[PDB]
Amino acid sequence: SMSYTWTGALITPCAAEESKLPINALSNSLLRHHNMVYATTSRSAGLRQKKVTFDRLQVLDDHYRDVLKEMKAKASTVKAKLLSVEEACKLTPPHSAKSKFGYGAKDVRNLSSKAVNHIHSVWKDLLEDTVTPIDTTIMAKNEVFCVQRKPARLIVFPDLGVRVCEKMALYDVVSTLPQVVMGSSYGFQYSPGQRVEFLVNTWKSKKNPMGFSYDTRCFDSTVTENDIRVEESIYQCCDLAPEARQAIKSLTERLYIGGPLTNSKGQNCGYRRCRASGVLTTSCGNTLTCYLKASAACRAAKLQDCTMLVNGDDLVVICESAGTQEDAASLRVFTEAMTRYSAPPGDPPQPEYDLELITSCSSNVSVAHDASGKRVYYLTRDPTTPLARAAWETARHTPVNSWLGNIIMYAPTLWARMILMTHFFSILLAQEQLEKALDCQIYGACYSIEPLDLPQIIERLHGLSAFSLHSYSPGEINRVASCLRKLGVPPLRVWRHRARSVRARLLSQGGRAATCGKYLFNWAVKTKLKLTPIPAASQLDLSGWFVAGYSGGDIYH
Numbered sequence: 001s002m003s004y005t006w007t008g009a010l011i012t013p014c015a016a017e018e019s020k021l022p023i024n025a026l027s028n029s030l031l032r033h034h035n036m037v038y039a040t041t042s043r044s045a046g047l048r049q050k051k052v053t054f055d056r057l058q059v060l061d062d063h064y065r066d067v068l069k070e071m072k073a074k075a076s077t078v079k080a081k082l083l084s085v086e087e088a089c090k091l092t093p094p095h096s097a098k099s100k101f102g103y104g105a106k107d108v109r110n111l112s113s114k115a116v117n118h119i120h121s122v123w124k125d126l127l128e129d130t131v132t133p134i135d136t137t138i139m140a141k142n143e144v145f146c147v148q149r150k151p152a153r154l155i156v157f158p159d160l161g162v163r164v165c166e167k168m169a170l171y172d173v174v175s176t177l178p179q180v181v182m183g184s185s186y187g188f189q190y191s192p193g194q195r196v197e198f199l200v201n202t203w204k205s206k207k208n209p210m211g212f213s214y215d216t217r218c219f220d221s222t223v224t225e226n227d228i229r230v231e232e233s234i235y236q237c238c239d240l241a242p243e244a245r246q247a248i249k250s251l252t253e254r255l256y257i258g259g260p261l262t263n264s265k266g267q268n269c270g271y272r273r274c275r276a277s278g279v280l281t282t283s284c285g286n287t288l289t290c291y292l293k294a295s296a297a298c299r300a301a302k303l304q305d306c307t308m309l310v311n312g313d314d315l316v317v318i319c320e321s322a323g324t325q326e327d328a329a330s331l332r333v334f335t336e337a338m339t340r341y342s343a344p345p346g347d348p349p350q351p352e353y354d355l356e357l358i359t360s361c362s363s364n365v366s367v368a369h370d371a372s373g374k375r376v377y378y379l380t381r382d383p384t385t386p387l388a389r390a391a392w393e394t395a396r397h398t399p400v401n402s403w404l405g406n407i408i409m410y411a412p413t414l415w416a417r418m419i420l421m422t423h424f425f426s427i428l429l430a431q432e433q434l435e436k437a438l439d440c441q442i443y444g445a446c447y448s449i450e451p452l453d454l455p456q457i458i459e460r461l462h463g464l465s466a467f468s469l470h471s472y473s474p475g476e477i478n479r480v481a482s483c484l485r486k487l488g489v490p491p492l493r494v495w496r497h498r499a500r501s502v503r504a505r506l507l508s509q510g511g512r513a514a515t516c517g518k519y520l521f522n523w524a525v526k527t528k529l530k531l532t533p534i535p536a537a538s539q540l541d542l543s544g545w546f547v548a549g550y551s552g553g554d555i556y557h
């Protein structure tokens, strides 16, 4: 069937949309080539609709069914609980889209009566009706990039009432099931450091390692009714309350399999027969489906000593090489199998024999050196999108602060330390907003973070090593330098100069601010300070951070 059917009604915005980078008094200090930076808007949604609309064929063989049986046997060991209305409510982000039925996210969060009462009626309807398709809104994402222009991604999501109900039925399931079914292959269980560790140990575990990333073309669109029903049958293996079983059956039939699409004006835009990108099960559903298909394709291609790492639609495989000719042949067969299962590639995969050249989840393993001179592996990425977004964020308040997310996830990196930390601490100092909590997104879920906790956060996730790294790789240094030339970002020596100032200003404030100065900016001084563990570091509850992925899942932790 077709992934989408369209009526011709447009995908429409809620408010005016900016596509050009906003400029303020701070912009030039970060980036001179403003025309290189853009945001996607609904006005390009038609281009996206074109790309994501196609027929899906699916041919399922014994490998597919063998792997599904295995996954189901592991899923049968999972026991999951229903969430209360109140529990689900507290998982709703403050900025989440309002209901059509007369309440908003903040009415949900402080548990207003009107909100709770509608949520109860949505649940009851789900229990009582397992056939009536549930309304969804289709919107165009506003995301920031550097010109290479990408059309807007689409988001499809049900009403706030339903979203709360999804959490009630499925939050526990999607939080716990994937690691049990997929074990070490489940990507969202890892911090950046742990992900590095897994990749490195896996690479070393092979006599002659070969790895490839596999890019499915428009993964959500390739997901069929079959796939979504199969994913439900996996959830149904769990030990669940009777109401949970019913609600999951109902959500699958009425929501997950497909449904009508409504624009922000209330017009029927058409019909969806593929993955909704804005439902609770998007991440878990995609991960299970990617893993199921990839696992079976590995068996089809007879890949030797395969190890998969799967993060929703993002897939990387490390295996034993058979030489370049046989590896190329193997991947072609792997790709043929994936194609038959309805996951054909965007870029065809290519075997890689250098771990540092494998990009997976937009990132790669690289190497630098700690204080002792000892080599330390860490996760990095091309800093172009991070810097484009940081520039947008310099002039505009956004619901999600990608700069803060990038500092957390990419703290050991040359570009996050020298540029992101320096820039945004300067901004926070000037406004005296060091103490103000900011929202960021990690593995799809929204976190309120106090910037002053950064040193504790980085110590816990990455270790004190992250404040001491030096002698980065020629490839990494060149990629950063190239990026700065592209965007017209000041050379790394200007940032060192600015960092000395930011460090000194922070030290003058004493307290947590001084702690930021000492740890975050020790790289900036010729004669360093001795960095020892931070006392308060244990107090922070980082449980829940790297357990599961929740993209489009409307989660607040």
Ligand SMILES: CC(C)CCn1nc(N2CCCC2)c(O)c(C2=Nc3ccc(NS(C)(=O)=O)cc3S(=O)(=O)N2)c1=O
Pocket (backbone or CB within 6 Å): 191, 192, 195, 282, 283, 286, 287, 311, 312, 313, 314, 360, 361, 362, 363, 379, 402, 405, 406, 409, 441, 442, 443, 444, 445, 549, 550, 551
């Ligand atoms: C250590 C890490 C692997 C480095 C790269 N990195 N960095 C992230 N962050 C850096 C600062 C902002 C968040 C981040 O959250 C993700 C991330 N991975 C995903 C991959 C694939 C899908 N596909 S889907 C729609 O769920 O089917 C979704 C997600 S996500 O939305 O849960 N977020 C990430 O991969």
